[PDB]
């Protein structure tokens, strides 16, 4: 067993992190105080769930997690909230004032004054790891910390841990819930810097989460707790394989190998179904056919885009609940004739499939109903470059007038780093188009 360390950066990473660790605990039967009756190795072990938890002589299972916000408001909630015994203080790291939705202030100005203390607290976790495999980094693109500190920490982690893997869970900026008009700036900036230090990035457009919450959960104006519970499920699906017995995606290097043939095109599209309101008065349960088909509907993706107008390089079906292979292939058979699922010549048309018999765990009281089977698809499609195009277009509109640029320059960043980052994204968009050029 090889341990995985989570790193929650910024308000979004921290609040998403909190929801994941609550979902995680429910799933492995760990109580709000790290106690886990079902573990019979008191004091430790090397079970599959020890990749995400380490063990205390007195019986505590404590996340291999580190939270870091540049101000105290949010992590204070964790220090005081319901799961406060689960983390020990050394891993909740908070600063004085924040990065004011300014990438340059999180990377250059305030970052420098905290990078070392954070790397310290991280190495403390590596030291109690028999065979550490890599990092799971949770952050937003749009704030100052989540973009600019996160890109600084990444570059340090690559220097300090070359052998290790790093996956991202990245919250893509959406007007319906954004709190800054500079978010496209911070998003290009931190994607450019981080591209070469992240092995696999799971982008979640707050826009997509928001509509799923309105359309399928009947939530008038979804809040961050709605958004984050849904994100906790998608994320739990993608990490189920590292915390449970299985033979698919059993270590971070396999997300690389299964999903990412090209290092820069490391942004696989997640798709999840079924999302059912727990308020629905009885629900006609969905079939393997029905849930697997759902996976090719844009309205179920973590990023709106049209994978018909691009090619595939990889595709994973992660099932949870009551599923047997015959059904899955029966299902894949039908849709293969109904849908437009063209791969890139230099790749085979196939699906890797993972089934975990234990159905999706529902947060008691939450908005999600408890379904007898569920599925997350991880497809590396080129249609996800739609999301790059529209974010790059917003950057261009503002940048051609230098609007707000003076805030980043005022922190010591040179105007030129803007065009460098955007030039990268222009290359990245060309890469994407080359791969999917055919029809």
């Amino acid at each position: 067993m090889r341990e995985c360390i989570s790193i929650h950066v910024g308000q979004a990473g921290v609040q998403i992190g909190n929801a994941c660790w609550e979902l995680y605990c429910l799933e492995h039967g760990i109580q709000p105080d790290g106690q886990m009756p079902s573990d019979k190795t008191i004091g430790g072990g090397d079970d599959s769930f020890n990749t995400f938890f380490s063990e205390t002589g007195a019986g505590k299972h404590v996340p291999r997690a580190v939270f870091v916000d540049l101000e105290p408001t949010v992590i204070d909630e964790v220090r005081t909230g319901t799961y406060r015994q689960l983390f020990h203080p050394e891993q909740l790291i908070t600063g004085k004032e924040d990065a004011a939705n300014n990438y340059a202030r999180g990377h250059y100005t305030i970052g420098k004054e905290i990078i070392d203390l954070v790397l310290d607290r991280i190495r403390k976790l590596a030291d109690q790891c028999t065979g550490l495999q890599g990092f799971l980094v949770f952050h937003s693109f749009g704030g100052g910390t989540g973009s600019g500190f996160t890109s600084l920490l990444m570059e340090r982690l690559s220097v300090d841990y070359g052998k290790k893997s790093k996956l991202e869970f990245s919250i893509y900026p959406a007007p319906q819930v954004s709190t800054a008009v500079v978010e496209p700036y911070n998003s290009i900036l931190t994607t450019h810097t981080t591209l070469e230090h992240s092995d696999c990035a799971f982008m979640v457009d707050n826009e997509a989460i928001y509509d799923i919450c309105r359309r399928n959960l009947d939530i008038e104006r979804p809040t961050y707790t709605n958004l984050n519970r849904l994100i906790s499920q998608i994320v739990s699906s993608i990490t189920a394989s590292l915390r449970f017995d299985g033979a698919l995606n059993v270590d971070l290097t396999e997300f690389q190998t299964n999903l990412v043939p090209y290092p820069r095109i490391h942004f696989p599209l997640a798709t999840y179904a079924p999302v059912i309101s727990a308020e629905k008065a009885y629900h006609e349960q969905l079939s393997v056919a029905e849930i697997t088909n759902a996976c090719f509907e844009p309205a179920n993706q973590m990023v709106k885009c049209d994978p018909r107008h691009g090619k595939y390089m990889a595709c994973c079906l992660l099932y949870r609940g009551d599923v047997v292979p015959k059904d899955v292939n029966a299902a894949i058979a039908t849709i293969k004739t109904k849908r437009s699922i063209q791969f890139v010549d230099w790749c085979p048309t196939g699906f890797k499939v993972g089934i975990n018999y234990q159905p999706p765990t529902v947060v008691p009281g939450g908005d999600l109903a408890k379904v007898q089977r569920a599925v997350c698809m991880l497809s590396n499609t080129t249609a996800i470059a739609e999301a790059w195009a529209r974010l790059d277009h917003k950057f261009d509109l503002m940048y051609a007038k230098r609007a707000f640029v003076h805030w980043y320059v005022g922190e010591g960043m040179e105007e030129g780093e803007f065009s460098e980052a955007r030039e990268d994204m222009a290359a990245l968009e060309k890469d994407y188009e080359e791969v999917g050029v055919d029809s």
Binding site: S158, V159, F351
Partner: protein, 54 residues
């Protein structure tokens, strides 16, 4: 069409199904980057304090 690598636990199953075959900076350079920046800024601020003293 072809089911490969089938593996079964008591938690679930794993397998592949293929329908058709085919056909870095250093802690050194990082400091020069950051310091140059806090440089570019401390100078801008001092340009400001100098104008304010005029």
């Amino acid at each position: 069409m072809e089911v490969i690598e089938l593996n079964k636990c008591t938690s679930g199953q794993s397998f592949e199904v293929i329908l058709k075959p085919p056909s870095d900076p250093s802690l050194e350079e990082i400091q020069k980057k950051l310091e140059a920046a806090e440089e570019r800024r401390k100078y801008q601020e001092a340009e400001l304090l100098k104008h304010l003293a005029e």
